Amino acid sequence: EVQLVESGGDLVKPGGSLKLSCAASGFSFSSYGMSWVRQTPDKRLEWVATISNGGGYTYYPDSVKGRFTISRDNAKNTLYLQMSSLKSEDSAMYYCARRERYDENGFAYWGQGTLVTVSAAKTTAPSVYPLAPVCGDTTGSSVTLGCLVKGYFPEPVTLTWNSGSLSSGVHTFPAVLQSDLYTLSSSVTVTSSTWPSQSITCNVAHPASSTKVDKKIEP
Amino acid sequence: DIVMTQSPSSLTVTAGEKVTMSCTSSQSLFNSGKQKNYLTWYQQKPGQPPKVLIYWASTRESGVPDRFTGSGSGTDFTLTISSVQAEDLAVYYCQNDYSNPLTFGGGTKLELKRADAAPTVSIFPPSSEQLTSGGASVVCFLNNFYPKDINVKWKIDGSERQNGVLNSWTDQDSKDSTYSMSSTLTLTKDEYERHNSYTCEATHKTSTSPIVKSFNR
Amino acid sequence: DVPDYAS
Numbered sequence: 001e002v003q004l005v006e007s008g009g010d011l012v013k014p015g016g017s018l019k020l021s022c023a024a025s026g027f028s029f030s031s032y033g034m035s036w037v038r039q040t041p042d043k044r045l046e047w048v049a050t051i052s053n054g055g056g057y058t059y060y061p062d063s064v065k066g067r068f069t070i071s072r073d074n075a076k077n078t079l080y081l082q083m084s085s086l087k088s089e090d091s092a093m094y095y096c097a098r099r100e101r102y103d104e105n106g107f108a109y110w111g112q113g114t115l116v117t118v119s120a121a122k123t124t125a126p127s128v129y130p131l132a133p134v135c136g137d138t139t140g141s142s143v144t145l146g147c148l149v150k151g152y153f154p155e156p157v158t159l160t161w162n163s164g165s166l167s168s169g170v171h172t173f174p175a176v177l178q179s180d181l182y183t184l185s186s187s188v189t190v191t192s193s194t195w196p197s198q199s200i201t202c203n204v205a206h207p208a209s210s211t212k213v214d215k216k217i218e219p
Numbered sequence: 220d221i222v223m224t225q226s227p228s229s230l231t232v233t234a235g236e237k238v239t240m241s242c243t244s245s246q247s248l249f250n251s252g253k254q255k256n257y258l259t260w261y262q263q264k265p266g267q268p269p270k271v272l273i274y275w276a277s278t279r280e281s282g283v284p285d286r287f288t289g290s291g292s293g294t295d296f297t298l299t300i301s302s303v304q305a306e307d308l309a310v311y312y313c314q315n316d317y318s319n320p321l322t323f324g325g326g327t328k329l330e331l332k333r334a335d336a337a338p339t340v341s342i343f344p345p346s347s348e349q350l351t352s353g354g355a356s357v358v359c360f361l362n363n364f365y366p367k368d369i370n371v372k373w374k375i376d377g378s379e380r381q382n383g384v385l386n387s388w389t390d391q392d393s394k395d396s397t398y399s400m401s402s403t404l405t406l407t408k409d410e411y412e413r414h415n416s417y418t419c420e421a422t423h424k425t426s427t428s429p430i431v432k433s434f435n436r
Numbered sequence: 437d438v439p440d441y442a443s
Contacts (some may be wrong), residue, residue: 045323054437059319104441106259106316110268131343134434144341173387173401185401187360319442
């Protein structure tokens with residue numbers, strides 16, 4: 001079974017250095033060349049480097065030329081990439097992929113990906129806000145309520161409505177970056193016969209700072 | 220470099236129907252020697268890496284289903300799915316694999332056809348907890364509508380507010396094929412304390428007029 | 437050790 005597992009992705013200061021590893025299996029590593037192919041957050045896919053099977057030929061796009069180096073260890077079945085002078089445009093999912101030297105048929109075998117984030121930001125735990133309905137709109141059939149998780153770094157955040165037991169009628173909107181800090185928002189819909197008799201508490205977890213915050217929507 | 224181009228960006232499909240995606244290199248991907256085009260088509264569903272679907276423009280890979288066919292030569296390439304099934308709602312990429320630098324198109328992303336629905340719009344004043352700290356974010360949600368293109372406007376006492384709004388759209392919900400959007404206007408407590416009403420105005424093909432949600436202090 | 441075919 002061809003297995004290409006990557007490691008190394010992390011938060012890096014811009015103008016830093018990072019070195020990822022790709023460990024291959026279920027084939028003879030040395031008969032095949034390899035590539036690093038990355039994915040940006042806009043899901044733009046791009047090639048980064050290719051190294052031929054005996055490490056005697058390496059290939060780079062201008063973006064990455066003279067900043068990254070692809071190398072291999074044929075004895076240890078491991079492929080590498082030394083990133084240096086990391087800009088924030090290089091935050092992406094980095095995939096190792098085999099070059100199909102025999103079949104010449106594209107990237108048939110990809111790895112799992114490892115994620116690099118190049119940001120000068122600092123861990124900041126968020127502010128969670130309960131968004132309680134307002135006018136006489138309030139009572140109909142459903143009341144919609146929400147949570148504003150404003151200003152955090154990095155990701156992830158786990159948001160639930162009452163610890164997971166309220167999944168029907170929930171909408172969590174993507175995080176957006178507004179100068180180093182993110183913001184996320186969620187809403188849940190429940191009947192007029194549900195809140196404010198029953199209680200809903202939005203729970204946000206931000207593991208990167210040990211934050212655990214329960215925010216009750218109350219009128 | 221051989222720049223690649225994919226059209227359309229989104230494609231709304233109905234299952235059982237034939238759908239066509241196009242790919243365009245800026246330079247012929249035709250290998251005169253081997254006599255084939257070195258253009259590959261990829262499918263990535265979310266979480267997964269890409270998957271090889273067709274290589275050498277037209278040669279379907281092993282285990283790929285019959286309904287997928289690659290067509291075209293030189294600079295113009297075409298992927299066909301002929302009974303688009305529900306498990307094809309993915310993103311499709313074409314790739315120059317002729318000359319390094321290897322270049323990928325932008326993707327065409329399938330979404331599923333469904334009837335029009337109107338945004339369910341709701342506005343929220345700032346929380347006292349927020350408002351304690353000097354911030355005033357007003358939130359408006361536009362949940363469960365179809366088709367995907369909606370426009371939002373914030374007005375504060377009838378004037379159009381331009382800057383300070385952040386928006387986050389979602390992908391086509393799995394369970395009912397709809398889309399959702401949120402819009403937060405963020406202001407200072409100062410600003411917030413000199414305006415009496417905030418209106419969230421939204422337009423969607425479902426509606427002749429913008430949809431209006433306001434609150435007053 | 438052969439070069440890369442897309443080269």
